Structures are given as C-alpha cells and as structure tokens.
Amino acid sequence: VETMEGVGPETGNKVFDPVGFATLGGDETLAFFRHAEIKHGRVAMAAMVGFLFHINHIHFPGYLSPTAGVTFEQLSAVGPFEAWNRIPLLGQWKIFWTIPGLEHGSECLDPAGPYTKGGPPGNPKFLKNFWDPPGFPKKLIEAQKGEKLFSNLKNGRLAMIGIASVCAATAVPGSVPLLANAPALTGPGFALPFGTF
Amino acid sequence: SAKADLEAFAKECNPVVGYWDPLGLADLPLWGQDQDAVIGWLRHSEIKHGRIAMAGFVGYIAHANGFRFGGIGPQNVVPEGASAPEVWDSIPFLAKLQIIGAIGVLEHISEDKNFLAADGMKHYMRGGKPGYFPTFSANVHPMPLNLFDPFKWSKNASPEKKAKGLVTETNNGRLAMLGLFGFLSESKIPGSVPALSGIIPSYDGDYMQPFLPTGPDTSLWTIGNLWA
Amino acid sequence: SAKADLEAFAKECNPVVGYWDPLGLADLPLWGQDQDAVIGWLRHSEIKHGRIAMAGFVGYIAHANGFRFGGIGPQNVVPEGASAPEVWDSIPFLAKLQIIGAIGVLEHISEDKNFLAADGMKHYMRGGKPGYFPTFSANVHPMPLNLFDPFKWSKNASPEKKAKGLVTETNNGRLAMLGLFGFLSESKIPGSVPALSGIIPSYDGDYMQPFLPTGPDTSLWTIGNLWA
Amino acid sequence: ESLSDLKTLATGLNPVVGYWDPLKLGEAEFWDNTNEETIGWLRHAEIKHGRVAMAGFVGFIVQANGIKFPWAPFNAITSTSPPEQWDQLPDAAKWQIILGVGFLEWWSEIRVDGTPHYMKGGKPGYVPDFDATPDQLPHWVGLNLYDPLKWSKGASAEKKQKGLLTELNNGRLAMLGIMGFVSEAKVPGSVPLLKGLVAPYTGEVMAPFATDIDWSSW
Numbered sequence: 001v002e003t004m005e006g007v008g009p010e011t012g013n014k015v016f017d018p019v020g021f022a023t024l025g026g027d028e029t030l031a032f033f034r035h036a037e038i039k040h041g042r043v044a045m046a047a048m049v050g051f052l053f054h055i056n057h058i059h060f061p062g063y064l065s066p067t068a069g070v071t072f073e074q075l076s077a078v079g080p081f082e083a084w085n086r087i088p089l090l091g092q093w094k095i096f097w098t099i100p101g102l103e104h105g106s107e108c109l110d111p112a113g114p115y116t117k118g119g120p121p122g123n124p125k126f127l128k129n130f131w132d133p134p135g136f137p138k139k140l141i142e143a144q145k146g147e148k149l150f151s152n153l154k155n156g157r158l159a160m161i162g163i164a165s166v167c168a169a170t171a172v173p174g175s176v177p178l179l180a181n182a183p184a185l186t187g188p189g190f191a192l193p194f195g196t197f
Numbered sequence: 198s199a200k201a202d203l204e205a206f207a208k209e210c211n212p213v214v215g216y217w218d219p220l221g222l223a224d225l226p227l228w229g230q231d232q233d234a235v236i237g238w239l240r241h242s243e244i245k246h247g248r249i250a251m252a253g254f255v256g257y258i259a260h261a262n263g264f265r266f267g268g269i270g271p272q273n274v275v276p277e278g279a280s281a282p283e284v285w286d287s288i289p290f291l292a293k294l295q296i297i298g299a300i301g302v303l304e305h306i307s308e309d310k311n312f313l314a315a316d317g318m319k320h321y322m323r324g325g326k327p328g329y330f331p332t333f334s335a336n337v338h339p340m341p342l343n344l345f346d347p348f349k350w351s352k353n354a355s356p357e358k359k360a361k362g363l364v365t366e367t368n369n370g371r372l373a374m375l376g377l378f379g380f381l382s383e384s385k386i387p388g389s390v391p392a393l394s395g396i397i398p399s400y401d402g403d404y405m406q407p408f409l410p411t412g413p414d415t416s417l418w419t420i421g422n423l424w425a
Numbered sequence: 426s427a428k429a430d431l432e433a434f435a436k437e438c439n440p441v442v443g444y445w446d447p448l449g450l451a452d453l454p455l456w457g458q459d460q461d462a463v464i465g466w467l468r469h470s471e472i473k474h475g476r477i478a479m480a481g482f483v484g485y486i487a488h489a490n491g492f493r494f495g496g497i498g499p500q501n502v503v504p505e506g507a508s509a510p511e512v513w514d515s516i517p518f519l520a521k522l523q524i525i526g527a528i529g530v531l532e533h534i535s536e537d538k539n540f541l542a543a544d545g546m547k548h549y550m551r552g553g554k555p556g557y558f559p560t561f562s563a564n565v566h567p568m569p570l571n572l573f574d575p576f577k578w579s580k581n582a583s584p585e586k587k588a589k590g591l592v593t594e595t596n597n598g599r600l601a602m603l604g605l606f607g608f609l610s611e612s613k614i615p616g617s618v619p620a621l622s623g624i625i626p627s628y629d630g631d632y633m634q635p636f637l638p639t640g641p642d643t644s645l646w647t648i649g650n651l652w653a
Numbered sequence: 654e655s656l657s658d659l660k661t662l663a664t665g666l667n668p669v670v671g672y673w674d675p676l677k678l679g680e681a682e683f684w685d686n687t688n689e690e691t692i693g694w695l696r697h698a699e700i701k702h703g704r705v706a707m708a709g710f711v712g713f714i715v716q717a718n719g720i721k722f723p724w725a726p727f728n729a730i731t732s733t734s735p736p737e738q739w740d741q742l743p744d745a746a747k748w749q750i751i752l753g754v755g756f757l758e759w760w761s762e763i764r765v766d767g768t769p770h771y772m773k774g775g776k777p778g779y780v781p782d783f784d785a786t787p788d789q790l791p792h793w794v795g796l797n798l799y800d801p802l803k804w805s806k807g808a809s810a811e812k813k814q815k816g817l818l819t820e821l822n823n824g825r826l827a828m829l830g831i832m833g834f835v836s837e838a839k840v841p842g843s844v845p846l847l848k849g850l851v852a853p854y855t856g857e858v859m860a861p862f863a864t865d866i867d868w869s870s871w
C-alpha cells in the first residue's frame with residue numbers, strides 16, 4: 001500500500017509516481033523498494049561526508065599498510081574515485097569482506113523476518129549497538145524518531161542527487177552548472193572494485 | 198463555470214471587444230482534464246506571461262538606459278553598452294543559472310499544494326484563483342517578507358478593487374507583451390516596429406535560446422575564497 | 426485602539442491635514458505582532474527620531490558657532506572651528522566608542538522590561554506609551570538624578586499639559602528633522618537647500634559611516650595614567 | 654530543579670535579567686542522569702570557574718605589578734608577562750602545582766562528612782571540612798581549605814546566601830577579566846582599553862609544559 005512514508009510537502013501531499021513501479025508488484029515489492037531506497041540514501045549520505053572529507057584534505061595521521069608504501073597523505077593528493085584505486089589490494093578485500101558480513105547479518109538475523117515479510121524496512125537494530133554504539137537516541141520518544149526517520153529519507157534522497165551530480169561532474173565536464181570547473185573533482189569519475197576489475 | 202467566468206472577464210476587460218477566441222482554445226482539453234482545468238491553465242499562463250513581459254519591459258528600459266545597483270561591484274562593472282540582449286550575455290553562467298533556479302523555485306512554490314492548502318487556496322487548474330501565489334508557507338528559513346505584497350500595503354483592499362486590479366494587470370500585461378515583442382523584433386529584423394526604428398541595435402544571437410555561448414568563469418569572490 | 430489613537434494624534438498635531446498615511450504604514454505587519462505593536466513601534470521610532478533630530482539641530486548650531494567647554498578632555502584635540510561635519514572626525518576613537526556605548530546603554534535601559542515595569546509601565550510595542558524613558562530606580566549604584574526630568578521641575582504637570590507637550594514635541598521634532606536633513610544635504614550636495622547655500626562648507630566623508638578614518642588614539646590623561 | 658534556578662536569578666540582577674541561556678544548558682540530561690544532577694554539576698562548574706578566575710586575576714595583577722617571591726627558585730626567572738613566567742618555570746614546579754590542585758579537588762569530591770554530593774543534593778562549590786572527620790584522612794592537617802582561621806564560622810544564613818551571590822557575580826566578572834588579559838597576551842587590538850598594557854606572547858596559553866602548536870591558522 002502507498003501510505004507508508006516519504007509522502008509529505010513539496011510534492012502535493014501525494015505519492016510521486018509517474019511510472020507504475022509502486023504497483024509493479026505487491027506489498028513485498030514495496031518493502032523491498034523502500035529498503036533499497038533507505039540503504040541507497042544512507043550510502044549516499046556516507047559517501048557525501050567522505051567526499052567532503054576528501055576535498056578538504058582531512059586524512060588520518062597514520063600510514064595505511066607500511067608494507068605497500070601507500071600513506072594517507074598521497075591518498076588525499078589525488079582526486080576522488082582515484083583514491084579507491086590506490087587502496088593497495090588487501091584493503092579492498094577487507095573493506096568488502098566487512099560489508100557483505102553486515103549485509104548478510106542485516107538480512108538474516110531478524111527475529112521478525114525479512115523486511116518484505118514482517119519487520120519495517122531499514123531496521124537493522126537487531127545488530128546490537130550497530131546503529132547506536134553510544135546512546136544518542138536513548139531517551140527520544142517514538143513521535144520524535146518518526147520525524148527523524150522522515151528527515152533521514154529526505155536527506156538520503158538529496159544525498160543521492162548530490163552524489164550523482166558529483167559523479168557526473170567528475171565524468172562529463174559542464175554537467176552541473178554550480179560545480180562548473182573545480183580544482184579538485186579531477187579523476188576518472190568512477191571507481192571499479194580492486195582498481196581495474 | 199469556467200467559460201462563463203472567461204466571458205465575464207473578457208467583457209470586463211473590453212466591453213466593445215468581448216470574447217475573442219478565433220482558434221477555439223477555450224474548449225479543447227489539453228491534457229484530458231475537461232474544460233475547467235484547461236481554462237484555468239490558459240488564464241494562469243496569460244497572467245504569468247503578462248507579468249513576465251511587464252518586468253521584461255521595465256528591465257529593458259533600465260538596462261538600455263544603463264544603471265548600477267546597491268553596491269554592485271560586478272554586475273554593473275562588466276559592460277558599458279549592452280543593447281538589452283547582450284546584458285544577459287556577459288554576466289557569469291553561474292549567475293544566470295542561479296537566476297533561472299530562483300525562478301524555478303518561485304514557480305514550484307506557486308504551484309505547490311502544501312503551500313496552497315496552508316494558505317486556504319487551491320491549484321489554478323483544480324478550481325482555484327489563477328495567478329495567486331503563497332506567501333511563505335512553512336520553509337523553516339523564516340522569510341522576512343511575502344511575495345505578493347512585500348510591505349503588506351494591500352491587505353485592506355476591497356474585492357472590487359482586487360478585481361479591477363486583476364483586470365488592469367491582465368490588460369497592462371498584454372500591452373507590455375506587445376511592446377516587448379516589438380522591441381525584440383526590432384532588435385533582430387529592422388523595419389518591424391515603425392516607431393522603434395533605430396532606437397535599438399542589432400544582435401546576432403537569439404534571445405529565444407536561453408543559455409547562449411556562456412560568459413566567463415567570473416570567480417568574483419575574495420577574502421580567502423578558492424573558487425567562485 | 427491603535428488606529429483611533431493615530432487618527433486623534435494626527436488631528437491634534439494638525440487639524441487641517443488630519444490622518445495622512447499615504448504608504449499604508451498603519452496596517453503594515455512587521456514580524457507578525459498585530460497592528461497595535463506595529464503602530465506603537467512606528468510612534469516610538471517617530472518620537473525618538475524627532476527628539477534626536479532636535480538635539481542634532483542644537484548640536485549642529487553649537488558646533489558651527491564653536492563653544493568648546495574647556496581643556497584636558499577631548500575638546501583640546503578638536504580644531505578651533507572645523508564645522509559640524511568634521512567635528513565628528515577628529516575626536517578620539519575611544520571617546521566616540523564610549524559615546525556610542527553610553528547611547529546604547531541608554532537605549533537598552535529605555536527598552537528594558539523590568540527597568541520599565543519598575544515605573545509601572547510596559548514596553549512601547551506591547552501596549553505602552555511610546556518614548557517614555559523610565560527613571561533610575563534599579564541602577565545598583567545610587568543615581569543622582571533621573572534622565573527625563575533632571576531637576577524634577579515637571580512633577581506638577583497635568584495630563585492635558587502632558588498631551589499638549591507631546592504633540593508640540595512631535596511637531597517640533599518633525600520640523601527639526603527637516604532642518605537637520607536640509608543642513609546635511611547642503612553639506613554634501615550643493616544647491617539642495619536654497620536658504621542654506623554658502624553657509625556651511627562641503628564635507629567629502631560619508632555622513633552615514635560612524636567608524637570612518639579613525640581619530641587620534643591619544644588619551645590626554647595624567648595622574649597615574651598607566652594606560653599608555 | 655529548573656525552578657530554583659530562577660529563584661537564584663531573581664536575586665542575581667533583579668528581574669532585569671533572569672533565567673538567561675540562549676542555548677538552554679538547563680533541562681539537559683548529560684551522562685545518563687537526571688536534570689537535577691546536570692543542574693548541580695553546572696552550578697558547581699560555574700562556581701569553580703569563578704573561584705579559579707578570581708584567584709588567577711589577583712595573581713596576574715600581583716605578578717605583572719612586580720611583586721615576586723624572593724626565596725630561591727622564583728628569583729631565577731626574570732620576566733613580566735605572567736604567561737611567560739609559567740612557561741619558564743621548571744617542569745617539576747608546574748607538575749607539583751597541578752598535582753596539589755588535583756589532591757585538593759580529590760578531597761573536594763569526597764563526601765565522608767557531609768551527606769550529599771553536589772549532584773545528589775549538596776551545595777555546589779562546597780569543599781568538605783578537613784577536621785570534621787579526623788579519622789578518615791591520611792595524616793592530620795589543620796588550617797582547612799575554606800576558612801582556615803574560622804573567621805566566618807558563626808554567621809547568619811542570609812549573609813551566607815548574599816556572599817554566595819556576590820561570589821557568583823564576582824566570579825563571572827573575573828572570568829571575563831582574565832580572558833581579556835589572556836586575549837591581550839595573544840591577540841593585539843582585541844579587548845580595548847587594555848591595548849597599552851600586556852606583552853605580545855605566543856605558545857598556546859591553554860597548554861602547559863611544551864609549546865609550538867598554537868591557533869596560528871585562527
């Protein structure tokens with residue numbers, strides 16, 4: 001059913017649905033689409049914060065694999081999406097093998113079941129203290145965190161638009177008018193896993 | 198409802214002329230939404246075109262005469278002679294894109310339903326007043342003033358005064374559209390406007406293709422600014 | 426309440442013109458605080474501007490004539506005749522900043538809540554009498570005299586005499602504002618004021634910039650003057 | 654207790670101001686506690702900052718005036734800018750100052766005689782009495798930290814609360830004054846009427862022992 005969340009102002013207080021999509025399937029298809037939207041949003045917001053850290057030259061005061069010789073300093077010297085191509089070859093393995101573990105746990109170990117059948121989409125709270133290693137929300141009421149989830153969805157959509165704009169500007173020059181030309185944002189415009197494959 | 202209101206507005210605007218619809222545009226469903234939505238969309242389009250044309254005529258006079266602004270320091274420093282059309286051909290592409298984005302934001306705020314239900318109005322093609330715009334709705338950033346009446350100097354007007362103002366706005370917008378189109382035609386094809394012969398120069402570019410070959414990068418920022 | 430009082434005050438100030446409000450300032454909402462607070466803020470601004478303008482006319486006459494009080498203080502650094510506009514360009518920066526701070530302290534004491542509620546009155550916008558600076562009752566240190574009536578010579582005044590004095594003060598403040606603005610315009614743009622042509626000299630510095638090229642940092646101090 | 658916070662402030666500067674906090678540090682919870690504990694903690698923090706600031710302001714006046722301990726190790730350093738006197742102190746002297754202050758506040762945290770802590774209902778800025786519990790300190794010392802000679806001792810409670818308000822106000826003013834003097838040592842032109850005094854200084858005032866990091870890039 002298209003009651004859900006994400007429907008509010010600046011869209012007519014109704015579902016934004018030119019193409020069917022929402023009615024392409026049933027209730028479980030909507031839950032999968034909402035989980036994809038929320039995960040996509042969260043990944044885009046994280047990518048935006050990381051990209052802002054990369055542009056402002058905020059790197060760790062460490063070494064990042066002294067055997068290879070790569071350091072944190074010359075990972076910030078190059079532009080975005082080229083730094084990932086220089087993260088040795090074991091580091092991509094470790095970042096990856098960490099992330100499927102989280103994906104497999106976030107789908108499997110639900111006491112209520114997958115988000116399509118029992119349990120709201122975008123809720124890996126069964127992974128204890130994964131979302132909140134400190135408290136942060138610990139005394140917030142339910143009516144507060146519903147509005148916070150709505151803000152989460154809106155900021156996720158905006159971050160998706162922003163990271164698409166950043167990728168387009170790094171790939172095709174002149175795509176984004178406000179970006180136009182920039183000292184940074186100079187690179188391949190995309191990152192393959194493990195550099196070349 | 199819509200046809201009778203259109204006929205009454207046409208009679209009020211010009212008692213001699215009345216309704217002048219040679220193409221029959223008041224009876225064609227443009228998007229299959231009956232005749233009320235089509236008539237409301239046509240009325241809103243006429244009002245918006247007239248308002249934009251009056252603003253364009255005033256800006257044409259101001260720019261062709263040449264004028265600075267408050268502080269300026271950049272907008273009135275680049276060109277000396279502009280000949281109207283080339284005034285929007287030497288400003289930065291970022292400035293023109295931001296002006297277009299602000300116009301689009303204003304249009305989206307005008308057409309929004311959440312900004313209309315809060316203000317107690319409806320859409321122009323769903324049984325509402327064509328040309329009405331929301332004041333500030335609720336955008337967190339508190340607007341210092343509204344858009345329709347910036348100083349709130351027209352909050353005591355009677356409904357007859359509002360109707361007379363709407364009719365006068367439509368007629369003056371039509372006249373300003375004729376004047377602006379005549380000036381644009383004289384800027385391209387000489388001899389079109391007989392009164393405006395020689396007043397305006399000739400431009401090789403097209404004013405109907407928006408973002409032309411763009412202006413400079415125009416960094417225009419200082420005090421520790423690394424880009425525009 | 427506000428509109429009837431405004432009309433009555435306009436009729437009392439001038440029975441011929443009456444309520445003359447061209448640019449709709451009676452019903453303009455500033456920050457969504459209704460019309461009574463808007464009218465109170467407008468009346469307080471008018472009264473303060475008129476009083477400051479009368480004081481400005483008196484000070485301009487005194488500075489143009491030249492009546493330096495004595496020595497030791499800032500009067501020893503002012504030149505012996507440099508007209509009113511250059512009088513506030515050679516005083517010490519510490520003296521000007523301290524005068525601005527004293528004026529700000531006076532304004533904050535005038536607009537304070539408890540410093541006005543101790544006199545049994547409210548704020549001017551929130552249903553109070555505009556322009557009523559309260560007496561010193563809670564200034565911690567023992568104040569020697571009040572600010573409105575220093576000699577307390579108007580303690581026997583009646584309410585009708587108070588209203589007549591308020592009307593006379595408003596009218597004289599408007600006239601003094603016109604005179605001071607005429608003198609300032611003649612000091613910059615020649616030929617503006619016809620009677621004030623050739624009387625006052627021309628000033629090149631901006632009269633709207635209080636922190637213009639800074640005055641001397643000399644203190645003119647003695648007896649234990651350890652502050653440089 | 655966001656109500657007694659207003660009763661304290663009605664006597665602060667009359668009702669001319671009252672409960673003035675633009676970012677509202679009151680009604681907070683902090684480290685997994687209740688609003689009353691946070692209010693008591695904030696009151697103790699304000700009182701301790703005020704006391705440290707009045708002591709530091711008096712010390713700055715005395716040191717920059719020229720009054721100096723003749724004895725032996727303080728005669729070695731010959732400067733004026735109080736901050737530089739701290740910088741050219743021996744490391745052991747600074748460490749012993751820090752550890753003595755730490756012992757004093759370790760005793761201040763200990764509540765073996767007074768029943769409440771300053772977060773659990775005790776008076777904020779209350780240093781417990783040394784000789785109140787003479788069998789629960791490592792070795793006997795007389796001359797208690799607050800009131801060494803029992804000059805106040807028997808006094809009216811009205812005088813006590815009036816002194817507490819006076820201490821709070823004087824503390825806030827001394828906080829402003831000592832930060833004005835420190836910013837004079839760091840930022841010239843800042844804090845007018847004090848430009849002709851104080852010396853230029855570098856070395857990140859809010860850091861003891863070594864130096865050379867600073868807020869150079871503002």
Ligand SMILES: CCCCCC(=O)OC\C(C=C=C1C(C)(C)C[C@H](OC(C)=O)C[C@@]1(C)O)=C/C=C/C(C)=C/C=C/C=C(C)/C=C/C=C(\C)C(=O)C[C@@]12O[C@]1(C)C[C@@H](O)CC2(C)C
Pocket residue numbers: 067090094097098099100101102104105
């Ligand atoms: C790697 C396999 C890890 C096993 C799995 C594991 O334990 O998971 C933990 C995990 C991620 C994760 C997850 C959590 C979020 C934590 C929990 C989730 O929980 C659920 C249910 O969701 C699951 C998961 C997987 O998502 C990641 C662990 C990663 C680990 C343990 C990584 C060791 C690197 C050591 C290196 C690179 C040594 C380099 C050594 C190098 C490169 C040398 O050159 C050595 C050298 O000698 C050479 C060759 C020659 C000599 O002359 C010189 C020297 C001496 C220098």
Ligand SMILES: CC(=O)O[C@H]1CC(C)(C)C(=C=C/C(C)=C/C=C/C(C)=C/C=C/C=C(C)/C=C/C=C(\C)C(=O)C[C@@]23O[C@]2(C)C[C@@H](O)CC3(C)C)[C@](C)(O)C1
Pocket residue numbers: 793794795796
């Ligand atoms: C160049 C110049 O100036 O010429 C000067 C030089 C000079 C020398 C200054 C001059 C002199 C003569 C002077 C000044 C003579 C002064 C002699 C003096 C004043 C000698 C004090 C002894 C103190 C004692 C024994 C303290 C014991 C103290 C003890 C044992 C305690 O504290 C115990 C304690 O139990 C208390 C008491 C309180 C308890 O709660 C806690 C504790 C446990 C801590 C002249 C003649 O004027 C000329």
Ligand SMILES: CC(=O)O[C@H]1CC(C)(C)C(=C=C/C(C)=C/C=C/C(C)=C/C=C/C=C(C)/C=C/C=C(\C)C(=O)C[C@@]23O[C@]2(C)C[C@@H](O)CC3(C)C)[C@](C)(O)C1
Pocket residue numbers: 707708710711805808812813816822823824826827829830831833844845846847
């Ligand atoms: C019960 C009873 O009877 O009470 C008795 C017992 C009791 C309580 C134990 C007593 C005590 C204890 C003591 C020792 C009390 C004293 C406490 C102390 C030592 C209090 C210092 C304050 C320092 C201040 C305020 C510094 C301000 C500094 C200020 C405000 C500034 O610098 C401002 C300024 O910088 C700006 C902001 C900008 C500049 O352009 C201008 C200036 C430079 C001006 C008494 C006194 O014996 C009385």
Ligand code: KC2
Pocket residue numbers: 064065066067068087088089090091092094095096098
């Ligand atoms: C994504 C999350 C992540 C996790 C959970 C995680 C866990 C652990 C643990 C378990 C506690 C250990 C013990 C460990 C140790 C090492 N890591 Mg991990 N590591 C992660 C990320 C990266 C990245 C991005 C890189 C990296 C590396 C190294 C090297 C360097 C080897 C050498 O000395 O050269 C060593 C010793 C670098 C590498 O790949 O070396 C080529 C490098 O680029 N690691 N790492």
Ligand code: KC2
Pocket residue numbers: 704705707708776777778779780781798799812813814815816817819820821823824
């Ligand atoms: C740098 C040190 C310092 C300075 C500069 C300073 C200045 C002033 C001033 C002048 C501005 C006044 C007027 C004043 C007044 C009071 N002080 Mg302060 N005081 C300092 C230190 C301490 C300590 C350590 C304690 C303390 C206290 C009290 C009490 C309460 C007595 C009582 O309630 O019996 C009162 C009335 C005790 C306490 O607050 O107990 C609840 C306590 O432990 N004070 N104090």
